[PDB]
Design a protein around this ligand. Structure first.
Ligand SMILES: [N]C1=N[C]=NC2=C1N=[C]N2[C]1O[C]([C]OP([O])(=O)/O=C(\[O])[C][C][C][C][C]2[C][C]SS2)[C]([O])[C]1[O]
Ligand SMILES: [Mg+2]
Length: 247
């Protein structure tokens, strides 16, 4: 019933940040303490595992605007991050391959968390990975999308991480993402309530702790995980083939 709260952050280097994520996920062994991690990235665009950078973003807008490009290990679509976006990961032991329940359980925690801040949100309704919003992996506030998520499962463990728009530059995100209006489908938590990243982070800590019945106590990354991250970075996340989507 006890867990690890990791405020493991690496703004400035999204690629190393994602390496940390996969590292805590891959080092995890069945029975370990559940993990909840919070982190932010500076202006970045993160594409999914099955995505190709040039098909989701403009290598120019990003070039000219100092937008970092990075590809995560989980599936899903392309999202824009800035210090106004709050990302967070959950890693727990797994006894099945049921993906729907993971997303279902994590959204319940997000909903209970946001409620503490007076923001009434709900999960999307459609099962279509190709649509930008209203999916069951999305959390909507009103008719706008405020958080998207993705996940992975392997023998003994499951991973779920999301991106929540708190006070992100939405115009920026819309301009950089190739879709086909985007500006009209997203929203920041602060468009609703005047709360800070810490307030949102602290709300989520409570929500997840109460919903999952896990007492997440602030901790630090281990040397083992820290080493695997360094290796995942040097051998993968730091390469162009990976971030372009070829590896
Ligand atoms: N950031 C954010 N949040 C929310 N939302 C969004 C963003 N950006 C952008 N956006 C929107 O969304 C969409 C997309 O779709 P999808 O496919 O669902 O995608 C997702 O969500 C994914 C997930 C992510 C996770 C995190 C990241 C890194 S690691 S964690 C688009 O287009 C728009 O509209
Ligand atoms: Mg999603």
């Amino acid at each position: 019933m006890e867990g690890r709260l990791l405020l493991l952050e690496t703004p400035g280097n999204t690629r190393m940040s994602l390496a940390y994520d996969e590292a805590i996920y891959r080092s995890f062994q069945y029975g370990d303490k559940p993990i909840l991690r919070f982190y932010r990235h500076d202006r970045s665009v993160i594409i999914g595992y099955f995505q190709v950078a040039e098909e989701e973003v403009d290598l120019d807008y990003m070039k000219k605007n100092g937008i970092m490009l990075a590809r995560r290990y989980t599936g899903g679509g392309a999202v824009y991050h800035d210090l106004g976006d709050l990302n967070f990961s959950v890693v727990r032991s797994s006894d099945d391959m049921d993906i729907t329940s993971m997303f279902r359980t994590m959204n319940e925690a997000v909903v209970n968390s946001l409620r503490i801040l007076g923001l009434d949100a709900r999960p999307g309704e459609l099962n279509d990975v190709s649509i930008p919003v209203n999916k069951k992996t999305d959390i909507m506030a009103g008719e706008k999308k405020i958080m998207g998520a993705a996940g992975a499962m392997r023998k003994g463990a499951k991973l779920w991480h999301a991106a929540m728009l708190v006070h992100t530059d939405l115009d920026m995100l819309s301009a950089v993402l190739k879709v086909p209006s985007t500006r009209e489908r997203v929203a920041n938590v602060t468009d609703f309530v005047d709360v800070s990243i810490d307030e949102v982070r602290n709300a989520l800590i409570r929500g997840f702790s109460e919903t999952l019945h896990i007492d997440f106590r602030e901790d630090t990354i281990t040397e083992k995980e820290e080493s695997l991250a360094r290796e995942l970075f040097d051998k993968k996340y730091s390469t162009e083939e990976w971030n372009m989507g070829l590896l």
